[PDB]
Recover the amino acids of this structure.
DNA sequence: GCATCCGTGAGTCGAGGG
DNA sequence: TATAATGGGAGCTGTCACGGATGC
RNA sequence: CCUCGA
């Protein structure tokens, strides 16, 4: 179904704050922000899709995402807060795209 | 949820299929209901103060404390509660009952408590001298429902008794939530001075908690049954 | 057991015109 | 790179005999 | 595709 102003603004806010949370997880962990983003994304979507991302220096497979997710679960509560923020950001991003997929059709029908 | 009409169930509560969430909304499944964008946040700020009242000794009911709605005294004939200080009147009305604070210059010189069954005879800002009637008690006078009497001290003088009540109650304050804002505080959470309730785009439109209180969420934009 | 919808076949060689 | 924009559009049908799945 | 020839 279509997004109301409030639902839209909420999802966009969650996406923004989740990207900020990924940057903060890069600051704390010393890990690569892209690898962190890919692990959060991987766990959000499922084991159905984990593939090799072109830019990543490490092959993305369930073993490395499990190691990285366990390194991300081993941090203090106030440092574990950003993991939940990023997970919520990913899920909000997914639902935002899926809720706006009709606009693409309405624009592409003209080309 | 249509605009202006409120929820008939509370955030976080289990619900059964067919149970109405609102006058025009019937839930088709069972589970936990959740609030989607409450447009009005009501903060009940808690207040602990000390007030006083004088009553005929024949009317009084001796008690160490007074639960809400409990009878404070019973008056055979109309009684006139009279000012025992001089100053300007600050009339503070609750849902039922009142506070009456006399101030001279800046410092308050008196704090009186008019329970239910006591009609104030003064206006806000009125100038009163000593012995001037501030209220009329008639019949039975009882504690209001919103306010309770923690402790009672009493002093016998003449044919009257004077009560010093340690009162504890809460006062409401409503905040209208605009769509671009978001509530960062749960239902029934305790907040202090400076704590953030509702965030916003720009700092000047944020909702900060003035004093100590509890939070209540009303008029949600919609309700999500999971 | 007997109607019905889908798919696949239905001449060769020329010539020209494209 | 920022007003808002949120589910398509072309659509004539004059054959017939075969195997095979699909239904009553 | 069409038309034409055998």
């Amino acid at each position: 179904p279509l997004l109301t102003l409030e639902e839209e603004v909420e999802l966009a806010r969650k996406v923004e704050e989740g990207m900020e949370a990924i940057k903060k997880l890069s600051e704390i962990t010393g890990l690569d922000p892209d690898l962190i983003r890919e692990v959060v994304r991987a766990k959000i979507l499922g084991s159905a899709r984990v593939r090799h991302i072109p830019g990543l220096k490490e092959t993305l497979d369930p073993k490395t995402v499990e190691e990285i997710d366990q390194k991300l679960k081993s941090l203090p509560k106030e440092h574990k807060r950003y993991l939940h923020i990023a997970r919520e950001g990913e899920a909000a991003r997914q639902h935002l795209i899926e809720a706006n997929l009709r606009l693409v059709v309405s624009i592409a029908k003209k080309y | 949820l249509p605009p202006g009409v409120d929820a008939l169930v509370k955030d976080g509560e289990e619900v059964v299929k067919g149970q109405e969430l609102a006058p025009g909304v019937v839930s088709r499944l069972d589970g936990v209901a959740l609030y989607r964008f409450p447009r009005r946040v009501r903060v009940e700020y808690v207040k602990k103060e000390r007030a006083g009242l004088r009553l005929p000794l024949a009317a009084w009911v001796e008690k160490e404390a007074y639960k809400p709605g409990e009878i404070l005294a019973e008056l055979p004939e109309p009684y006139l509660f009279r000012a025992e200080e001089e100053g300007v009147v600050e009339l503070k009305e609750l849902e039922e009952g009142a506070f009456l604070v006399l101030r001279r210059e800046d410092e308050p010189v008196a704090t009186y408590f008019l329970p239910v069954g006591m009609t104030p005879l003064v206006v806000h800002g009125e100038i009163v001298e000593k012995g001037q009637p501030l209220a009329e008690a008639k019949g039975l006078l009882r504690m209001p429902r919103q306010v309770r009497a923690a402790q009672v001290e009493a002093e016998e003088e003449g044919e009257t008794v004077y009560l010093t009540l340690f009162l504890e109650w809460t006062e409401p304050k409503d905040y209208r939530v605009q769509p671009h804002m978001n509530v960062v505080v749960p239902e029934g959470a305790r907040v202090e001075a400076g704590d953030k309730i509702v965030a916003a785009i720009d700092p000047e439109e944020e909702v900060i908690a003035e004093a100590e209180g509890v939070v209540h969420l009303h008029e949600p934009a919609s309700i999500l049954v999971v």
In short: The CA atoms of residues 5 and 18 of chain A lie 20 Å apart. The domain at 1-111 of chain A is CATH 1.20.120.1810 (Four Helix Bundle (Hemerythrin (Met), subunit A)). Chain A has one domain: 1-111. Chain A touches chain B through seven residues (CB under 8 Å).
